[PDB]
């Protein structure tokens, strides 16, 4: 994550590590939305241009970690995928639209102090809480820097939501309604961004009204990392809710 810090421990219990089995290498992040399902960027699983394509088998999930490195033998759970749900209309050839993916873990997880699910937003939360100005919290283990570098522990940064127009002029890519962009304006004199390796991590917000943490987005794409006048894009988790259930109470 660029320009933020060491996540407190047990601070984002829904954070997940999408880890390639062998080479044992980190891919991206995910969230725990219930006790058999995780939520991630589809691009984290399939993105051909990078001749990237995993199966429920290349991958492993690590729930409960602090450290980017150490095997937390008694706090973290190494879990296995059962099936992958990659959004059908995921537009990886254009602007990565609906960069969403669901993974069903083989046998369920046991919540600890270190492991707890986040909440998908409802129509009213989504509604009262997603506005230019409000601030969300991004989390990851990826690139600390655009270029020149990895956290040794969980990095957290809190960035505010930015107006569609500003988002829309931030760049040349087609910004749609299933994405939002968060980050500091240039004249705002503050910084922070998610960067390569962050994708899949949750973009969460805490309710005033009820005090629970709601996942509002997933790290989708962005150009550079912490470039001025450039904002980062996140998947509209809500705008994609329907699918999210048609598949979960289905299969």
């Amino acid at each position: 994550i660029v320009e933020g810090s060491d996540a407190e421990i047990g601070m984002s219990p829904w954070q997940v590590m999408l880890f390639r089995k062998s080479p044992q290498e980190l891919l991206c992040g995910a969230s725990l939305i219930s006790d058999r399902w995780v939520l991630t960027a589809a691009h984290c699983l399939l993105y051909p241009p990078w001749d990237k394509n995993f199966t429920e088998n290349d991958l492993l999930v690590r729930i409960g970690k602090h450290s980017r490195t150490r095997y937390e033998r008694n706090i973290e759970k190494i879990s296995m995928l059962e099936k992958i749900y990659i959004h059908p209309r995921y537009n990886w050839r254009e602007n990565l639209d609906r960069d969403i993916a669901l993974m069903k873990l083989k046998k369920p997880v046991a919540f600890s102090d270190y492991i707890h699910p986040v909440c998908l937003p409802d129509r009213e939360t989504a509604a009262s809480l997603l506005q230019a100005g409000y601030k969300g919290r991004v989390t990851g283990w990826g690139n600390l820097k655009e270029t020149w570098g990895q956290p040794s522990v969980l990095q957290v940064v809190n960035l505010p939501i930015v107006e569609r127009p500003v988002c829309k002029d931030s760049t040349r890519i087609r910004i749609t309604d299933n994405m939002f962009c968060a980050g500091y304006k240039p004249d705002e004199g503050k910084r922070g961004d998610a960067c390569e390796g962050d994708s899949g991590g949750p973009f969460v917000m805490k309710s005033p009204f009820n005090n629970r943490w709601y996942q509002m987005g997933i790290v989708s794409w962005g150009e550079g990392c912490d470039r001025d006048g450039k904002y980062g894009f996140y998947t509209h988790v809500f705008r994609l809710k329907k699918w999210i259930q048609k598949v979960i109470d289905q299969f």
């Binding site: 601070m11 707890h116 909440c119 409000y134 809190n158 917000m205 005033p208």
Partner: peptide
């Protein structure tokens, strides 16, 4: 699963504030 969702055992449930939680909460009221 989640119904008991998005409530941190080492925070909301101990009634502890994470060190930045608040930069966020004020961003709504402010």
């Amino acid at each position: 699963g989640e119904a008991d969702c998005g409530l941190r055992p080492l925070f909301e449930k101990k009634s502890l504030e994470d060190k930045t939680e608040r930069e966020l909460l004020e961003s709504y009221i402010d």
